[PDB]
Design a protein around this ligand. Structure first.
Ligand SMILES: [Cl-]
Length: 261
């Protein structure tokens, strides 16, 4: 089953944007489809995304990747991005292809969006797509309120007021991270850990203890907000935020394979 290229329109009027997607059909329609949900500033050609697709291909199961608005091959401005808009895109991509069974594979911000997506699907009457499992890699639920807000100083707070965004130096590039006022305000609209989260499926979290961006304690906090059954947390002592060494990729591929078989 070959990779196919698609464009999906999301939103209305001046909010409309075209989302680029790469899709591989399952060898038989009854088999699940793995859907990649990436990190803030990622793109769908990244190492972990390509590995998810390769594993899916080898087992004859489906694979969906797409670029968030403002990222990679998709339309829309980065500074117009919010958790609400990026979630809306994820749901639109799923509703375009309508796989019978989905396994959500969410990395960092993509883990937050995965948790919101299951809530949106469970709220619907007509759901052609059942989520059969979720694999979360250094997930970052509620990062705006829980990881950013407590560290903000008066520099950042005034920047947010005067300019509509603040900047922080990025370990991973010469272009610094920017975080908009709109993202911070809307992150509270999408807060998932202020109460208990109902998934209805197995969840496996993979988290490094040498992660300087999402502290491993954040993964322990997420487990306290998940159901009392069918949740596994794998803590890797020397793992960093990217979790993309060969040994890390082996653990992630094995976690996804256990959701299929
Ligand atoms: Cl990656």
């Amino acid at each position: 089953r070959p990779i196919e290229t698609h464009a999906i329109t999301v939103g209305q009027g001046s909010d409309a944007r075209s989302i680029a997607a790469l899709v591989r059909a399952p060898a038989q329609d009854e088999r699940p489809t793995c859907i990649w949900l990436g990190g803030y500033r990622s793109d769908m050609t990244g190492t972990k995304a390509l590995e998810m697709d390769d594993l899916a291909a080898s087992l004859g199961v489906g694979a969906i990747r797409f670029d968030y608005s403002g990222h990679g091959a998709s339309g829309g401005a980065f500074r117009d991005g919010t958790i609400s808009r990026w979630l809306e895109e994820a749901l639109a991509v799923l509703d375009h292809f309508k796989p019978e069974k989905a396994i959500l594979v969410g990395s960092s911000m993509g883990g937050w969006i995965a948790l919101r997506l299951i809530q949106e699907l469970k709220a619907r009457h007509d759901n052609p797509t059942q989520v059969s499992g979720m694999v979360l890699i250094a997930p970052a639920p509620d990062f705006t309120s829980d990881l950013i807000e407590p560290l903000l100083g008066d520099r950042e707070r005034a920047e947010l007021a005067e300019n509509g965004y603040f900047e922080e130096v990025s370990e991973y590039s010469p272009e610094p991270n920017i975080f908009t006022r709109a993202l911070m305000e809307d992150g509270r609209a999408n807060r998932v850990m202020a109460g208990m989260i109902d998934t209805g499926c197995p969840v496996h979290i993979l988290q490094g203890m040498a992660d300087p961006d999402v502290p491993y304690q954040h993964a322990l906090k997420l487990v306290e907000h998940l159901p009392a059954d069918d949740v596994v947390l794998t803590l890797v002592r020397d793992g960093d935020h990217r979790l993309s060494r060969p040994q890390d990729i082996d653990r992630m591929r094995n976690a996804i394979r256990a959701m299929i078989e």
